[PDB]
Structure formats: structure tokens, C-alpha cells
Design a protein around this nucleic acid. Structure first.
Lengths: 140, 99, 190, 38, 200, 310, 140
RNA sequence: UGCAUGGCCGCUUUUGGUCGGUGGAGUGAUUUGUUUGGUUGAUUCCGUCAACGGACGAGAUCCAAGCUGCCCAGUAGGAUUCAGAAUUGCCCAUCCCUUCCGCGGGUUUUACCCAAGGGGGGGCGGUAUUCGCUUGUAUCCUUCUCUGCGGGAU
RNA sequence: UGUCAGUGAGAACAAGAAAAACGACUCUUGUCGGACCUACUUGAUCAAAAGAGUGGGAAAACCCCGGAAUCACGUAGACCCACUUGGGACCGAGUAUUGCAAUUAUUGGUCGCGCAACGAGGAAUGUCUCGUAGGCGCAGCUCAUCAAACUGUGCCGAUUACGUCC
């Protein structure tokens, strides 16, 4: 492993591959974007970036944790049931992305459902995160 | 492969008479003896209302069992295992295994 | 070196500070720790609560009223901001302003019910040192919650406002008015 | 469900850990090896 | 396993209850069982071992047969033995049965209980207690105590030393309760909580 | 006085200095807070407000208090009798364990080294006098059933012409044993209370054994007979012999005194302080002669080791 | 040159592996110290190392594996296992004098060092919820 | 029908309370023991007395938690090298420093600061990561774990 | 509601405890696998609910035996002092799942109504002094099926008092 948490994985490993991936297309954009991504919304899926805060991160989780997928990988999914029926709030996940995200890894920086690196492209291209921000970073 | 002996019992001082004492017979005498330290001891906890009616202070109990699982290991006895498992007869729920 | 002997909040220095009152000096102590975040056992004995600074005590009693409130770490996030605000407003080290405000917002005399005969009677009763500290803290940080309760637009800033006006003796502050009105009964009746 | 040491089916059936001893209460009907010490 | 221990509990329960009812006033203490590998000894603790066996031998094989027909056991996997318990005094349940017999014969409560007390406290017991609640009047539900020697109810240790029996007597007007305790002079933990001794 | 070692957090029960060791000047002493301290004399200018030396290492971690410690003859190791099951040869080079010697179910009272680095001797409250080698195999365990009670202290004879070990007792004996055959040699008796300590002078022909009565029986090991007694007049907490003299200078619960076979009484009596029992209640629990044998370091009830000169 | 110590506070155990360095900036888990997402806990873990020489005695390579309680208690446990490791190193490889200096200053500066803070939990009991506030009263 | 009753549970009562033998006192019901004082959660203690010597509850024995020794390893988890993936960060900072020392400059002096060299330590590469599967390939161990039995103060 | 704060995203990270076996099939000279869970992959060239196949376990094995809430976050997110984008309770339409039988049983689901209440709430009254109170989540329990309940474990974790007897 190598990916995530070596550059600050929370907010300084995300925006940089995001820019690069939208600038030249790579990952899935399949219809289903509008549909509920996180439990019991009263709003739309998000204000902007419906399924473009997702894809590399959903590779990252499975990478460093070795073959967490489809039921384990929603482990680092979310759901609080933040609106509820006046009972004690409980955790959930929405399966929608699981299918698409186990498809993903066969292209771009990972190989297979057993081996999750190639040259580990994301790491190498993320070495310029530290050097210079692309967001006007506070710490750079 | 290597044969192991797990002895599962409700009570201590039944299993004790098995492991310590009657493994001496298999210690280097016919096979070699690798002692680890026995597996974690489960509790079976049950909670029972004391009162047989709806008027009390709504009291309850805590009842517990110990489950002693005593594991000691040997290095491949075959046909010798017959001796090993015929040794304890000293309490009920003494059960032994052979791989 | 340079964090061995030196002690900071992260830029705020404890050399500057002086205890403002001479009534209080064993219930007001100086900070050395870089966050007021607690992790110890803070009470076990009648005085063991005065071994520690006003900062820590204040930040712990900052707010309550749980519903999913983030407690200590959340409080510390507001502490940081409020110190910066107080700094540029007084043009002076924020810590030393806190030292002042806790002392000068405290009621120093009280009067109590203690009479009998189907009736009450009031006498001038001096406030003890630890009580001046504690009472002041609670009143200041009560004010905060009430100010943001449905009102203002301000999140940390109300704390900074209160701590300033308290140190000035100005009667804007929630703590000051209490000292005032109590003493108008406790030095007008003995 | 139903019980096998009464036929009452009411006054509550334990089926926890595959036993019934609450259609005949276990305080009265002990010697199952359980004890209370804590 | 989890289930082993529970099922052993079940087996003991059923067994113990069957005997303690239908075989009684023999000085029945109880039963004890242990395995000898694909056979179970199942010794039967009685003061009088002759009734257990039978003088026609019918009793012992009846009791084997009942167990077999219930649990699907066969011969050579199941056996029943007798054991001679000396001093009926030191068995709670046994004294309980003899007392029950006195009362059903319509003998005086006082006289009856005094028999038990005499017997027990002769063999060197620390104390005994006979608490007979129930009818003796009407119109009360009167409770009579008889307390002898000394007895402890402190700790959880007491429970091991002191064995207890509760039984019923069924008479005209209805039920009479009976209870017997008896603190043994011999520990079953080999432990005391009082008297520091000095070895001289 | 002439420097002091003030670094302890618990009672100095037993102090040990080179007298069978000629390697370095290091001392080793038993703290009673579940640690063992290994000192050395390093800097002294013999002034009160300066130290006699610095701690070399601290050998740490036990379930219970240390009893006594002995320096290895040239091994640079420190063997410990411990009120826990463990008996550890330790190291003074690295400060950490060499090997654990476990033969004891009730805990070690006294350890010492043979004058050649060879045998370890472990007393105990087992009532077992064990001859271990230094390897960590138990070579033998002595008995004729002679021990009925605790082995108070053990001191090898510095003569190995006949291999001997001189053990005390709480059975009110001093038992000399021929090591080789595990045979009980002549019992030396008449002690009216339990032995506090048993030491042997450098010639190996004279053994000073003590008791709680406050008298020291001087014993010929050569004949198994008795010489003239030295009477302290107070309970003996430690008894020793100088390397370069025959001066006993026994420790007592009033201080350290200067005893010898010349007078068998004080030359001077060195009190640890004035108004002892109206202050800190000091007693001298142990005395360790230096390699010089002209300085005597006293252990204490108090958390200090003091220098005392003759 | 090595030593291995542990922190313990609450149900979090920390394991401090020390491996000889004379530089290395101290880190934790898979995420080093400048990338620890809670700034507050980061600061806690800093005071361990910072005080008693910032990088003057803090030069050993110390990385940890901490599991068994929430984020906060893990950060506590971290501090403990770090300082423990320093101390034990300076015991074995170095004289008691240096250790005494270091240690005494640790002890002074409000953690204590020595204490596991081993105040755990309450049992839940009866017929009652937590420690008493009952159900709520019946009249009396 | 719980006002026919057995057993069980609740409460009185979460407090320190309870009872008999022999002797003393009173016609008796009763009392003394079980009592002025101090101490303690405690009829817990010391002292005193027509009480003397006793039995229960309390205490203690038990169960769990915190620290630890011994047991101690194949489903508990680490250590080093072999191993290759991978990184070897110079695109906005970690080749540049620290310590000790010597000399020359900018200072009238002080504070402050610049240059050069000697000795010493490794730092980014002689310490490089992390993989809880690369489950690969080598080596070693019991700190982290675990359970039984013992240590540890009123 | 501004002291998760309301809708969005991402990071790091927890502990007891539950589970399996039917005279039902097949197997032989005396007999083995199906009513428990979780893993993995299809369930997205197009939703959720939900379908199915492979794989392991009698548990320190169950895939790392243990994870997503309280929390952290300035990623320069969105809302922003309103009964709203704060809250749900009523109400209609659709569908799948469970069962011997559903009649909102189903309910982890869609998407309406929210502009329906309610703005810390009179008198009165409850209970705790420390890892406690308070805040938060998970499992067990009951059992065709549902937990605002009960029981147990864990996480975040104070203020005041440590006195008197009114």
C-alpha cells in the first residue's frame, strides 16, 4: 500500500486528482447520479459534484485496506439516518455505488480484483500536492 | 497433522485433573508436549426476573456460567491418542478431540 | 530545544501575565499547556480544583445543554478564535485580559437567607476566593449561550465582547450587573 | 411459539440458548448449573 | 461448547426430579453422574440402598429402562449403581423425607422435629434448623421455628457448606410446608472465614 | 561527612561493595521500592553538599522488594535475592536481565558468589539451599532435612580447599555444609534467637555469626569449636569483616560501632545523628566495607547512604 | 538499538516501537505528525515530544500502532508510549544520570508521566439504568 | 377465594439491629447482659459496671475491575534480513545543519551580525516508509495478547 | 437549532454478545448434508426496496474479528437568525420483503402534504459529588414479522459541593 494519508488524505489527496480526472475523463459518470447517495436526504444528491467527490477515494479505501469491497467498503461509507421517524437514529448505506466502484479498478492505477496497484499512479502524481497547491492551500 | 486436545467443561477442577496430571503420560514419554496457555473463557449470561408477579420493584438477576476451554498441543501422535483420551473419566462434560 | 523551557498556547506568552488582584492568587494560576483540553482527574478533594488555571476551568464550564454537543474539543475550537479577537481589540495579550475579567466580574459580597421566625433576615456575607472565581466564570459563559440563542449572528465573538467589557467594569457584561446589584443590597443592609 | 415443560404457552417462554425454564421459573427449577455470585 | 453444558444441566434436572419424587423415604440424597467414555455411571445416593436395587431386582432395571426409552440410550452406554451414604443426619433431603413421613402419619409437629434435631446434632453437626410453616391452626398460616447450634447465612460461601431441602406434606385442610437445612461440620470448600488459629 | 549518596526512594536494606570483586569501584544497593540501584564512586571531593558518586545504572522492575545483591567477581553482573519468585543475574553493562533462575515457590532470601565466578547459592523460604551454577542450570540442592526453617543468609567460605558454604537459619543453627556430597558438617549452636546474618573473614578460618539477641559468636570453622564472643549489647542488624583487617565493626539499631578481636568493645561509637529516636528513627540496616577496608558505608532505614571513616 | 514499550489508557493500548535514530521526526500509524486531522489531538501528542527537548532527546524513530478506543483516548495513549520509549532507551544504552534528568522533568509537567489513568467504566446494574437516575420516581 | 394454603418475590430496613443460659433486681408484667464517655458506615472498638460467659447480622469468606510475578503459544502479534512491488519527495522550502574552537570584517562602545577554517554527530540516501495478504520468499522472539495459580499497604 | 447547526463530502477510529440442527432425505452390517451468520461477485449501458450463485464457520475460524454515532474538517461546501432550507405528525398513490393467515402487520423504500404542531415553555416535581451526571451508538432480549421498551458492553465526558440537619 501507499495511497491515502501520506499527503493528508482528508482534503489534500482529493482535490488534485479530482481536477486532473475532470480535465481528462477517466472514471464512470453513469446515470444514477441524481439518485440518493447517502441515507434519508430531503435535498438532491449534492449541490455540485454528484459522483465527483467519490471515485478515486473509493479506489483508495480498497487499496490500503486490501480487498474491502461491496460490503466492507461501505464501512468507510456513510449514513447516519440524520432525519428519522422519531426513533433512535441508526447507520446505513446505499448499495448504488458498490457495483460501479468494483468495476472501476480494472482501469486507471489498479489492475484487478486481487491486485490493486500498477505503478500506483495516484501517489506519484500526488507528489506535486506538497510542492504547490491548486486550491491556494493554507499550508503551502 | 499435529493432534491437539481441547477439553471443554463447565467447571474448573475437573479439566485441571485432565491437563496437568494426565498429560505427564504423553509429555516426552511417547510424544512431545508443546504447552500454550488456554483459550479465552466465555460467559453465558442470562437475566431472570425474580418476581412471579407485577408487584415488586421490578427486580432482576444476573446468572453466569464459566466455559473453560483448555488447549494443549502435541506433535503428531497416531494410535497413541487412544491412551490420551481414555485417561480422564473423572467428571462429566470431559470431551477430547483428535485431528 | 525551543519548547523545553519555553511555554506557549502557540504564540501567547505567560511571562507578560501578572495576577491582577491580591485577594486572589491561589485560585488564579497561570497556564503552561498548549491547549486547555482536559484529560486528568480534576476533583477528588475540597481544594484540588485550585491547582490549575482559570483558563482550563472556564473552557470546561463553557457550555452544557447536550443534544449531540461536541463537548471539550469543540470548546477548544472556539477558545482559539476568541483569543485572537480579544488580542486585537485590547491590543494586548488576550490571556491577561481573561485574568482581569474573572476578578472584576465576580461578586465580592453577598447576602443570604438565614433568618427564622417565619421570616428571612439578610446580613453582609463576604464571598470566599474560590467562589469569586467560579461564580464569575459561570455568569460570563451563561451570557454567551443566551446571546447566540436565537440572536446575533456571532458564534465565538460574544465571548470576546463579554471578557472585554468585564475587564473594563462596563455594565454591558452579564457578570458586572450582578456584582453591582447584589452589593447594593449587601452594603445597604447589614 | 410453544413450550415443552408446560403446555400453557403463556406466562412467557424462554427460547434463549435453546432451553425453556421460564414456564417453570428457574429460581424454583434450578440445577441447570447456573449460579449468581455477582 | 455452549450447548454441551446446557444439555448436561437439562439431563441432570430431569433425572434428579424423577428420582426425588417417585423414589422417596429411602434417605435419598440425590444423584451424581460422570462419564467413563461411551458409558455413564450414574450413581444413586441413598441411605438405604436395598430399595434402590430391589429384592426382585425390578427397581434398578425399571429406572435404567425409563431413561433409555426417553433419551434413546442402550445398554452398555447407560448404567445405574447404588451408593451407601452413612449418617442420614448429614443429608438434608434425607432428614426432610423422614420428617415428612412423621407428619403425614399425623404425629405432633414438636415431637417430629425434635427427632430430626436429636439425630443430626448427635453426629457432630454445627447446627440445624427446621422451619415448618403452614397449617397447624385454621386460620393462621402459622410459622414455627426450631433453631439449634449455629448457622451462617453470610457471604456466598454459606451456600456450599449448608445444603437445604424444601418439601411439602399434603394433609386435610390443605398443604403443610416443611424445610430442613443443617450446617455440616465438614466444609465443601475446605475454608473458614472465622477463627485465626495459632500453631504453637 | 565525606560525600553522601542521597538518591533513594525507599529503605536501603542491604549494601554491597567490592570485597570479592576487584573490578571497578562500583557499589550496588537494594532499594525497597521494587528497584535495585547500581552505583559507582565517580566524583567525590569529600564534601557534604557534594556527592560521593553517581548512579551507573538502575536495574528495574519486580513484583516485590529486593533483599540483597552481590557483585559478580569479575563478571560485571549483579545477582539479586528478591521477595518475588524471580532471581536474576542481571547485567551492569546494559542494565538489563541476563537470565531468570526460577526454582523457587517461596522467595529468595540471600544470594552471594563463590570467590571464583562459578557457583551461585540461593537460599529461600522454601527451606532449600540450592547450588546453581552461573549458567542457569540448578546443579544440586543440598539437604539432609537439616533445614526446618528459613535460610537467613549464606556466605561462601573464601577457602575452597574444602568446598564449603556457611548457612544461617531461623532454626537457631549455623550449618556448614560440604558442597560436593551435600553433607551436613558440624552444627554450631547456642544462638538464642534467629541468625541475622553470617559472614566469614578473608582467611576462611573464623566465622562471625550473629543473632537477634545482640551477641556475636565467633566460631572456628577449622575445629568446629567456639572462640570468645563479642557482645554488642544491642540487637545486630548486620555483621561483617574488613578485607584488610579482622575488624568486625557490627551494625546495630543504635548505629555502627567499632568492634574487633583486640578489644571486643567500642574504640569510638559512631552515632548516625544526635537525638536519633526523637527525630527520624534511623537504624543501620547494613554495612558494606570498601575495597580499601578503611571506609565503611552504612545503609539506613532512611533514604541515604553515608560515608563513615575509621 | 531498540526498546518496545506500551501506553495504556482506557481500552486503548498503544505499542511504541523504538528503532535507533538520531533524527527522525516522530510519527504515528499510517499518518505522520503534520497531517493528523484533529488539530487538538495533534497538539496533545506534540507536548509529549516538545517538552524535555524538542528534538534534543526526541531523536529516536518512534512509530506506534494504537487500537482499542476512540480517537481521543488513542492520542493520550500515544503520548504515554512515546515518553516511556525514550526513558527505557536512556535506561539501557545510557547512564541513570541522563535518565534521571529527563524523567524528573516529565514527572513535573502535568501528565504525571507515571500513571496509566486507569479509571475505566461503570457496570449497568439491576433494574436500573447506568448508575442511579432510576426510571423516574413514584411518589413516596 | 392470596382472609384455607405451600413455595417464591416485594417492603418494613439499607439502617445496626436480634436472642437465649446462669446469676442479680421486682408480687408481677419486666429489667440487667444489650450500660455514662470517645471512636466508626457499623451492638466497629477501648474503657467502665450486677453482670458472667455465648450465638447471629455486621466484619470476613466469595464475584468483577485496576498494577504485577509465574504459566505462556499454530488460529494471540511483533522483531531483523533475504524478497519484489513501491517510494528514492530538488515544481514554492526538511545537499544543509548542530555542537566545540580559532581568526578577520560591518559596530566608537554595547547589543546585533557577516566571512573562512579545524575538530565532533549524523541528517536527505550509512536511520527510507507502510502493506494489518506481496498470505508471498528467509530468520528470530514473547513487549503488545491470553487464562489458571500467587504477589501488593491502615 | 448556530454550544452537528441544517440538507454535502472525506478522514481516523469500539466491546461485550448472539449462531447449528428436524427420525428429514442420503448414507450401512450400524448412518451424512439443508431452517445461524458473515465473506465475495452479479444486483448500473441505468433507482431504492429487492433477486440469485459460489465460499467459510459450532466461533481467538465468522476474513484481518470488528468501521463509519458522539467526534474530527477548512476541503476555502451549502444554509443562515427563520416556525425555515429548523422539526416531524397527519394524508394519498406505487412496489417489494416476511408468514399458517394480513385487514398501512410488513416498512431497512420510493414521494406527496410540512406554509400541522412546538421557539427552551405557569404552579409543581424528579436524581446523581467522578470517569459520575449529561451526550451518543451497538448487540442481546421477545420471535411469522416490528423496540420510542428492557438487559449488557463501549465511545465522548463536565460544573458545583466534599457541609449541615434546617
Amino acid at each position: 500500500i501507499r495511497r491515502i494519508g501520506k499527503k493528508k488524505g482528508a482534503t489534500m489527496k482529493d482535490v488534485h486528482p479530482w481536477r486532473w480526472v475532470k480535465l481528462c475523463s477517466q472514471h464512470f459518470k453513469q446515470e444514477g447520479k441524481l439518485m440518493v447517495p447517502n441515507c434519508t436526504e430531503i435535498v438532491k444528491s449534492s449541490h455540485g459534484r454528484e459522483r465527483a467527490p467519490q471515485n478515486p477515494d473509493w479506489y483508495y479505501i480498497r487499496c490500503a485496506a486490501i480487498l474491502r469491497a461491496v460490503y466492507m467498503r461501505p464501512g468507510v461509507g456513510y449514513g447516519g439516518l440524520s432525519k428519522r421517524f422519531s426513533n433512535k437514529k441508526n447507520r446505513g448505506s446505499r448499495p448504488e455505488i458498490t457495483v460501479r466502484a468494483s468495476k472501476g479498478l480494472l482501469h486507471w492505477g489498479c489492475k484487478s480484483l486481487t491486485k490493486l496497484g500498477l505503478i500506483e499512479k495516484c501517489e506519484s502524481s500526488g507528489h506535486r500536492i506538497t510542492k504547490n497547491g491548486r486550491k491556494l492551500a493554507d499550508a503551502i | 497433522q499435529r493432534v491437539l486436545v481441547k477439553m471443554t467443561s463447565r467447571n474448573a477442577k475437573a479439566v485441571e485433573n485432565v491437563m496437568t496430571e494426565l498429560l505427564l503420560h504423553a509429555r516426552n514419554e511417547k510424544v512431545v508436549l508443546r504447552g500454550p496457555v488456554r483459550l479465552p473463557t466465555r460467559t453465558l449470561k442470562v437475566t431472570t426476573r425474580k418476581t412471579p408477579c407485577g408487584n415488586g420493584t421490578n427486580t432482576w438477576d444476573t446468572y453466569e456460567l464459566k466455559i473453560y476451554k483448555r488447549l494443549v498441543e502435541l506433535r503428531a501422535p497416531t494410535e497413541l491418542v487412544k491412551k490420551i483420551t481414555s485417561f480422564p473419566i473423572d467428571a462429566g462434560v470431559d470431551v477430547a478431540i483428535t485431528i | 530545544m525551543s519548547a523545553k523551557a519555553p511555554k506557549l498556547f502557540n504564540k501567547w506568552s505567560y511571562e507578560n501575565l501578572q495576577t491582577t488582584e491580591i485577594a486572589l492568587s491561589d485560585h488564579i494560576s497561570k497556564t503552561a499547556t498548549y491547549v486547555p483540553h482536559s484529560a486528568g482527574r480534576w476533583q477528588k478533594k475540597r481544594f484540588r480544583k485550585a491547582r490549575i488555571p482559570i483558563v482550563e476551568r472556564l473552557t470546561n464550564g463553557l457550555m452544557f445543554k447536550g443534544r449531540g454537543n461536541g463537548k471539550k474539543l469543540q470548546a477548544v475550537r472556539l477558545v482559539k478564535h476568541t483569543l485572537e479577537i480579544i488580542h486585537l481589540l485590547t491590543d494586548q495579550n488576550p490571556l491577561q485580559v481573561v485574568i482581569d475579567a474573572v476578578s472584576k466580574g465576580a461578586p465580592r459580597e453577598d447576602s443570604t437567607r438565614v433568618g427564622s421566625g417565619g421570616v428571612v433576615r439578610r446580613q453582609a456575607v463576604d464571598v470566599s476566593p474560590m467562589r469569586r472565581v467560579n461564580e464569575a466564570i459561570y455568569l460570563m459563559c451563561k451570557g454567551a449561550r443566551e446571546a447566540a440563542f436565537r440572536n446575533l449572528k456571532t458564534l465565538p465573538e460574544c465571548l470576546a465582547d463579554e471578557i472585554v467589557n468585564a475587564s473594563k467594569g462596563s455594565s454591558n457584561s452579564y457578570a458586572i450587573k450582578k456584582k453591582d446589584e447584589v452589593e447594593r443590597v449587601a452594603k445597604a443592609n447589614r | 411459539r410453544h413450550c415443552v415443560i408446560c403446555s400453557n404457552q403463556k406466562a412467557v417462554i424462554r427460547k434463549y440458548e435453546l432451553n425453556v425454564c421460564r414456564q417453570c421459573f428457574r429460581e424454583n427449577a434450578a440445577n441447570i448449573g447456573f449460579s449468581k455470585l455477582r | 461448547k455452549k450447548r454441551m453444558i446446557i444439555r448436561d444441566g437439562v439431563f441432570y434436572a430431569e433425572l434428579f426430579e424423577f428420582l426425588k419424587r417417585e423414589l422417596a423415604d429411602d434417605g435419598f440424597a440425590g444423584v451424581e453422574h460422570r462419564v467413563t467414555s461411551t458409558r455413564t455411571e450414574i450413581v444413586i445416593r441413598a441411605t438405604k440402598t436395598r430399595e434402590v436395587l430391589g429384592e426382585k431386582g425390578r427397581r434398578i432395571r425399571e429406572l435404567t429402562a425409563c431413561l433409555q426409552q426417553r433419551f434413546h440410550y442402550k445398554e452398555g452406554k447407560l448404567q445405574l449403581f447404588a451408593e451407601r451414604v452413612e449418617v442420614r443426619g448429614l443429608s438434608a433431603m434425607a432428614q426432610a423425607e423422614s420428617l415428612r413421613f412423621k407428619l403425614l402419619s399425623n404425629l405432633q409437629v414438636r415431637r417430629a422435629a425434635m427427632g430430626i434435631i436429636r439425630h443430626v446434632m448427635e453426629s457432630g453437626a454445627k447446627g440445624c434448623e427446621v422451619t415448618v410453616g403452614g397449617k397447624i391452626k385454621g386460620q393462621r398460616a402459622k410459622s414455627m421455628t426450631f433453631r439449634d447450634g449455629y448457622m451462617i447465612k453470610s457471604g456466598t460461601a454459606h451456600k456450599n457448606f449448608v445444603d437445604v431441602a424444601t418439601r411439602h406434606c399434603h394433609l386435610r385442610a390443605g398443604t403443610l410446608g416443611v424445610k430442613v437445612k443443617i450446617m455440616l461440620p465438614k466444609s465443601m470448600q475446605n475454608e473458614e472465614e472465622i477463627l485465626p488459629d495459632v500453631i504453637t | 561527612y565525606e560525600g553522601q549518596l542521597k538518591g533513594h526512594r525507599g529503605w536501603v536494606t542491604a549494601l554491597a561493595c567490592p570485597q570479592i570483586t576487584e573490578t571497578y569501584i562500583k557499589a550496588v544497593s537494594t532499594s525497597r521500592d521494587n528497584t535495585l540501584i547500581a552505583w559507582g564512586s565517580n566524583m567525590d571531593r569529600n564534601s557534604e553538599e557534594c556527592e560521593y558518586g553517581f548512579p551507573e545504572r538502575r536495574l528495574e522492575g519486580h513484583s516485590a522488594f529486593v533483599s540483597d545483591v552481590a557483585l559478580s567477581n569479575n563478571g560485571d553482573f549483579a545477582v539479586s535475592a528478591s521477595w518475588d519468585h524471580s532471581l536474576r543475574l542481571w547485567n551492569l553493562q546494559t542494565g538489563v536481565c541476563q537470565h531468570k533462575f526460577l526454582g523457587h515457590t517461596k522467595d529468595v532470601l540471600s544470594v552471594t558468589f563463590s570467590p571464583d565466578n562459578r557457583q551461585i547459592v540461593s537460599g529461600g523460604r522454601d527451606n532449600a539451599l540450592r547450588v546453581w551454577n552461573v549458567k542457569g542450570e540448578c546443579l544440586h540442592t543440598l539437604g539432609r532435612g537439616a533445614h526446618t526453617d528459613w535460610v537467613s543468609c549464606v556466605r561462601f567460605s573464601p577457602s575452597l580447599e574444602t568446598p564449603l558454604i556457611v548457612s544461617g537459619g531461623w532454626d537457631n543453627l549455623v550449618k556448614v555444609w560440604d558442597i560436593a556430597s551435600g553433607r551436613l558438617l558440624t552444627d554450631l549452636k547456642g544462638h538464642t534467637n534467629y541468625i541475622t546474618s553470617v559472614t566469614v573473614s578473608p582467611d576462611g578460618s573464623l566465622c562471625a555469626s550473629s543473632d537477634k539477641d545482640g551477641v556475636a559468636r565467633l566460631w572456628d570453622l577449622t575445629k568446629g569449636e567456639a572462640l570468645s564472643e563479642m557482645a554488642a549489647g544491642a540487637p545486630i542488624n548486620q555483621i561483617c569483616f574488613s578485607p584488610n583487617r579482622y575488624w568486625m565493626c557490627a551494625a546495630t539499631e543504635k548505629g555502627i560501632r567499632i568492634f574487633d578481636l583486640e578489644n571486643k568493645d567500642v574504640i569510638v561509637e559512631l552515632a548516625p545523628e544526635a537525638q536519633q529516636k526523637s527525630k527520624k528513627t534511623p537504624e543501620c540496616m547494613s554495612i558494606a566495607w570498601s575495597a580499601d577496608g578503611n571506609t565503611l558505608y552504612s545503609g539506613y532505614t532512611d533514604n541515604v547512604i553515608r560515608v563513615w571513616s575509621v | 538499538k531498540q526498546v518496545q514499550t506500551f501506553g495504556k489508557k482506557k481500552t486503548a493500548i498503544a505499542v511504541a516501537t523504538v528503532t535507533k535514530a538520531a533524527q527522525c521526526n516522530i510519527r504515528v500509524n499510517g499518518v505522520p505528525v503534520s497531517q493528523i486531522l484533529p488539530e487538538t489531538l495533534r497538539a496533545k501528542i506534540m507536548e509529549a515530544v516538545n517538552v524535555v527537548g524538542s528534538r534534543h532527546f526526541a531523536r529516536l524513530r518512534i512509530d506506534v500502532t494504537v487500537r482499542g478506543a476512540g480517537q481521543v483516548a488513542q492520542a493520550y495513549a500515544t503520548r504515554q508510549a512515546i515518553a516511556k520509549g525514550l526513558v527505557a532507551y536512556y535506561q539501557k544504552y545510557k547512564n541513570e544520570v541522563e535518565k534521571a534528568a529527563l524523567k524528573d522533568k516529565y514527572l513535573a509537567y502535568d501528565k504525571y508521566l507515571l500513571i496509566a489513568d486507569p479509571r475505566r467504566c461503570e457496570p449497568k446494574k439491576w433494574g436500573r439504568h447506568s448508575a442511579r437516575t432510576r426510571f423516574t420516581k413514584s411518589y413516596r
